Design a binder for this molecule. Structure first.
Ligand SMILES: CCOC[C@H]1CC2=C(CN1Cc1cccc(F)c1)C(=O)N(Cc1ccc(Cl)cc1)C1=NCCN12
Ligand SMILES: CCOC[C@H]1CC2=C(CN1Cc1cccc(F)c1)C(=O)N(Cc1ccc(Cl)cc1)C1=NCCN12
Ligand SMILES: CCOC[C@H]1CC2=C(CN1Cc1cccc(F)c1)C(=O)N(Cc1ccc(Cl)cc1)C1=NCCN12
Ligand SMILES: CCOC[C@H]1CC2=C(CN1Cc1cccc(F)c1)C(=O)N(Cc1ccc(Cl)cc1)C1=NCCN12
Ligand SMILES: CCOC[C@H]1CC2=C(CN1Cc1cccc(F)c1)C(=O)N(Cc1ccc(Cl)cc1)C1=NCCN12
Ligand SMILES: CCOC[C@H]1CC2=C(CN1Cc1cccc(F)c1)C(=O)N(Cc1ccc(Cl)cc1)C1=NCCN12
Ligand SMILES: CCOC[C@H]1CC2=C(CN1Cc1cccc(F)c1)C(=O)N(Cc1ccc(Cl)cc1)C1=NCCN12
Ligand SMILES: CCOC[C@H]1CC2=C(CN1Cc1cccc(F)c1)C(=O)N(Cc1ccc(Cl)cc1)C1=NCCN12
Lengths: 190, 189, 190, 192, 193, 190, 190, 189, 190
């Protein structure tokens, strides 16, 4: 149950609204349209409060809708502030795509976090012409995902295509070697 | 239930076994593997009884599996006897494909029978590459069906593709003009 | 149901197979492809036994599939023997259509039988153009039915269209006055 | 469930199920809810028995809660059409269209066992849709009741007015009461 | 849960739910399937914003698969009725009445993010019952498509014949393709990010 | 889902409570008893605040219960203020009945709005006399609705009966021509 | 419905028992244990009637259980008679594996028949040790299937592994080029 | 329902927000992503309030998702304050993994609390190669968990593997001897 | 349920929160982890308010999870304040165990309350060794419960084992005679 937080009671908020106060956005669920619209609004709200201060996007999500993921992706690239990303626990599907889309040099993963990449999933039923339409669409969607992943990791599109043909699980250090993140966040002091 | 008929001498058969004794095969249900396997067996059995007498295929079917329909189609083309076809009631999907596959000049429809043609149906769920494999296969299947329909009707492949893009209902008279059947069977005496 | 068995020589038959020996065919259920295919076969079998003796079609049926009914209809008109019809209990939908398809002068109903006429039922779900295709098809079907009903009853096509717009229940006497049957079969005893 | 009876005959061992054995003695069992399948089978048996002998009586055993009105009329009209007298007897219970067919037997040959029950009521139905569709259904079911009440009046001797009151609600009658009403001619007293 | 935003100002701390904060900047979120409830809320928001200021632009964010055609026309007719220009932007996806409403924004102020997708198609429906009932439903859904195609032709500049052919089946367009087609006026590009 | 509006000069309202402050009532759902009871209460509250200022009824509804619709209709006719009506999106069944019940000259429709008229729907299960009771009640209700519709539109009762036998869809312009509305509201400026 | 066949009635059998009389076995369903046990018994019965006469195995099946398929495979290889195979309509999964296991030179397909090859499918749920057990088992099963397929087609195991990684659909002529069958059965005369 | 507590001055909190005011975090349910995200946020919020005061993590949980458990585990190791842990009632699966992850010398269990350890669970359905990918991943995950448990308890990897092969129930006293906790909290005054 | 609200100064609280102000905790439902965690928190909160004043635990509960009950049990024995217990209505399973866990001399029941004791319930489905593990665990659990019950009632462990073999219903007076409570709380009025 979402706990209520008391600052210094004096002032009270739910935990996630208190995070937003520090310019932290929680992407901690499956990505559907509602989740994306919320995150888009939060990003635009933070830019309006300060168009130069970094924003922090916490990712612990199995992914979800590709179009919903691109709503968030395009909003990240449109705003002025750097958006840092960190994988907490797990990032798969569009979750890991967004992790890789954080400001260059500010993409992180905790030491035991897991990153998964794969090709998109879909579906089609009906006449042959309708199956062809869905196939052409999902294949075009895969090409768009692979091109951007190639641009943000430094790997070739051919390697991205090969490495996502099947479910591919990466450790935090492996995600750094791959170019999906920049640093494995080490503990501060203790 | 399936009635029993007596008769020549006093013999009792179920009505459909009696039909087979006159070299008539009833394709009167949705086409699945079990239906196709039975019809293939009946066709081969009739050819073994007499390799020169015509065979008669009665079609009142909404169609079904494409591969099951081709099992029947290939057996018709393989055996020596002519296989006559007649649409009674309705012939759709592979049912109308098999109606058009009868012996040239021996494909019929009763006056108020209906013929429907359309493109094949299918599905696909999974990774983008699995969707592509499923789409490529169903498109090849549609192309295979359309080529034969072009040969059997005399229409161009372009017209077959356009006319099967959506559900197309044809009257018996329209089916003859289209080339799916040769004659509308008219009431005798 | 528990269909009783009758014994006669040396022949035991279920009650319905015994009927066929007298050239009587029972149309006593909803009309589907299975029922139509069996009745078409029975009609052809009876003609092969004797191409001149009348056949008798008993009808106690709510109707059913239009194409299944036409399989029977066309087989009736194709074969040489006269096919008499009689409504027992109720004839609705394609059941009353087939009742009216008997050899003229040999269509009957029992005094308390009911006949119902009405327009065909159908459905359509999908794109606008798919709905239009299904509508044009079921309208063409209704015209085909009304055309034939007009020929076999003597009513104008416009009258048939009007009387079948809604469910229309007819007594045996009214079915005769309407032209659906030729005579109400009355008891020749008390 | 249904036992088989075997009898040494002229042409050798012959086997019947108990219900087919009853039919060989011109006994027809109406012992279930009346649907189209039950009515069509009973219509076929009545015509078969008349073809075997057009003057010998037929015996219709009734233990049924009733059912479809049109199915019941298929049996009713077949009874009135054939030449042989059709006797009726209620065993256990005859309700709805069951008691209608019980009263439809040959005059003087309508019976009920001493503890059998007879029930009469008005027809049941349903209707869902536009107002004009409900009107069509209401007119039809009301016509059906008038038809049923008229024949019941002819079969029992009671006026149409009394039939309307006595069938407005479920009305249970004893065997003696049924005889009294005219639905049956005599209550069958124990054979010796 | 819809998060709450705190605005530290020259007087202190103010709290709104995130969407009420969007409305304060004259931004309306069309981010779900379009049913009657969604349309009635958006119609109310458009009328409220015009009452607050009849000349400031309004911004309609669209990430929606579409839905009811009559619900979408409630929104369309309110956009055209009010005085302020209504800008539209496709975020993520605009399909069915979603892409129709995207094309209905003020001319020159219809946008899409670079990776957003636009889909156009013909309306969907159903019908079950008597033949004359099927005919009525078919006539109605076909008239609705003529209406949609007529307005879509006016908003895009394409002919009604081309729109009919291009919506016969599901048609997916990229942002640039939506601009070339005339459904949007500009692909909103990132300034250096 | 329902947004809250912040209005300068310290009040926060849900959007529908804000509409009521402008004497606007939203009939935007299927009409059941709860919907009617709330709308009746709103109408009485607005009259108590001001007995001469117009009230505005927004209609985007598929209709619903006839008695619930008449609860709204009778309250409209009872109160002193004029009740203007406008069809936005769609008005069918009791929805279109209430649209035509607005103050004469103040019944509107947006240009692309749809109006649907039809006869009432119902059901009946049981004894023959019970179905007769249900049928008599539905026909009475139809007459009532038709008679009022005739008075509100100027069309004869015979034409209303014919035009509502089946589902009848009308454009905004067709609704004006029929007399169900007075004006097609055209664009401010535009 | 399985029809009854009358020879010269005189003698009557169901259609499939009449086929068996000609040493024809129908593999026309999904392969489960019951189907395999039946076919094993039929093969042994035919060998007992004549240990030198060819046997004919008709295949129109989507496949099924791998162990059930190997029951049939091993019985084919154990008996003395040649077992001819023919793809009728479709053969996939173990169906196509059995098609390829027919006597060399007597493996056929009708011209429009389809052959599909793929890797085996399975499942596992539970502790990590149990998932490992199922994985090792299904991988071993794939190696056994690929080795035999390599022996009966002439292709290398590496090529079989590559070509079955995904669903692979072959035409009759393609199946012959691949080595899964020997001849495409052409029509005899007409 | 969650009770409301009053109190110092007159202040009202729900009982769990009152716990957080004393730097106590309740891990009292099955561990899914939503639970982990909330606990990660509470840990970071407490560190922002005071980076030197201990934090107290109450555990009464059957466990749940392994990745969600590691989200909590990594946040505990990342922040500066010591995070104390105590098992109340029961700690199983990732719940017992997190109990063992507390600050050295500050991992507790009430006397009648239960600790269970076992290997991770999962599933897999599809082609042989998909089953292999799923098995390889869950085996790597089990190896990752076992390595940390070895470091946190002092037991060898061999013993951890044997002791988690099947469901293993431990008493509080047994959990201390095993090295999963440091002390059994005994009743005071 | 509709929990009423009481008002008092200036404080409005639901009836259960008002109870806590008097150091009364309500254990009035089946015992699950959620209920246990809340009661543990309440106990610690009350001790933090005053480590010397008695706490009062009302019990009207069918029991539930054994581990959840022990969370409460151990918290009761850990804190300094005495915890009084009283059975209201019924205390069964872990509910009667916790009733017996109150401070000696301060365990009560209302005159017509019922107490039930019995052995724990559990399950086990799978391999022989898995069933043995679950059996040994639930037997160890029963010994732990019987050991403590023996200490707090004064009965031998063997007597407890015998009396809990089956469901055992006790009156308030019998619960006192058994040692589960210390006194039957009688009315100090009429
Ligand atoms: C309808 C066309 O217009 C689009 C434009 C309008 C607009 C934007 C950004 N849009 C582009 C866009 C949209 C979605 C994602 C994205 F990456 C860019 C914006 O960022 N703000 C400032 C703000 C936002 C949220 C709050 Cl809560 C407070 C302040 C703004 N204020 C008035 C209009 N407007
Ligand atoms: C590898 C198997 O290829 C076998 C070939 C063998 C064969 C055929 C035809 N098969 C080819 C085939 C198969 C399917 C469809 C098709 F178009 C051609 C055949 O027709 N008969 C005669 C017969 C059949 C059924 C009965 Cl009931 C009685 C007699 C026959 N008797 C022994 C072997 N054999
Ligand atoms: C596919 C070509 O079909 C032509 C023709 C073949 C045929 C017919 C009738 N077909 C036309 C037809 C079909 C359906 C309905 C209809 F109104 C007319 C027929 O009636 N008989 C006699 C018979 C039939 C059933 C039995 Cl049980 C016993 C004897 C017959 N014997 C060999 C071929 N043949
Ligand atoms: C289609 C219109 O005409 C039907 C008519 C013809 C006929 C009758 C009586 N039908 C009238 C009828 C039908 C239904 C109910 C009813 F009350 C009367 C009949 O009774 N038999 C003798 C018989 C019947 C069943 C067997 Cl099992 C054996 C012998 C007969 N044999 C050939 C034609 N025919
Ligand atoms: C019933 C017939 O008339 C309706 C008319 C009346 C009206 C309108 C506009 N309606 C037309 C309309 C309706 C729906 C959509 C559309 F495109 C135009 C309006 O915009 N306002 C101002 C306002 C609105 C919302 C808020 Cl929250 C605050 C202020 C207003 N105030 C009193 C009446 N009225
Ligand atoms: C239990 C161990 O023994 C096995 C052996 C016994 C046996 C066989 C073959 N088994 C080997 C086997 C079994 C399954 C498949 C397979 F490839 C080989 C056999 O083929 N026949 C002849 C026969 C068979 C079926 C009929 Cl219907 C009539 C005659 C036989 N007769 C007695 C024992 N026996
Ligand atoms: C790419 C994002 O990496 C962000 C980094 C930023 C950050 C952290 C820690 N993140 C790393 C991280 C994330 C998840 C777990 C974990 F172990 C460490 C932080 O702890 N605080 C203080 C704070 C937090 C919650 C509240 Cl309620 C109030 C204050 C903070 N304030 C602004 C940015 N920021
Ligand atoms: C993980 C280490 O746990 C040790 C200790 C921490 C602690 C306790 C009790 N723990 C032990 C414990 C836990 C569960 C049950 C139990 F019987 C004893 C405590 O009682 N209080 C005071 C308090 C609590 C709740 C509120 Cl609402 C207000 C005040 C406290 N304040 C800071 C740390 N701490």
């Amino acid at each position: 149950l979402i706990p209520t937080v008391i600052e210094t009671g004096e002032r009270a908020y739910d935990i996630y609204s208190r995070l937003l106060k520090d310019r932290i956005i929680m992407l901690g669920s499956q990505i559907d349209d509602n989740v994306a619209n919320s995150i888009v609004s939060q990003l635009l709200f933070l830019q309006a409060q300060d168009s130069e201060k970094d924003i922090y996007l916490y990712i612990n999500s199995p992914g979800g809708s590709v179009t919903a993921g691109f709503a968030i992706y395009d909003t990240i690239q449109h705003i002025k502030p750097d958006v840092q990303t960190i994988c907490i626990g797990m990032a798969a599907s569009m979750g890991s795509f967004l992790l890789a889309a954080g400001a260059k040099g500010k993409r992180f993963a905790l030491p035991n976090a897991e990153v998964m990449i794969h090709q998109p999933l879909g579906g089609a039923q009906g006449q042959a012409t309708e199956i062809e339409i869905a196939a052409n669409h999902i294949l075009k969607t895969r090409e768009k995902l692979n091109r951007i992943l190639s641009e943000r990791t430094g790997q070739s599109i051919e390697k991205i295509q090969k490495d996502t043909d099947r479910d591919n699980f990466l450790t935090a250090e492996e995600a750094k070697e791959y170019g999906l993140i920049d640093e494995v966040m080490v503990p501060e002091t203790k």
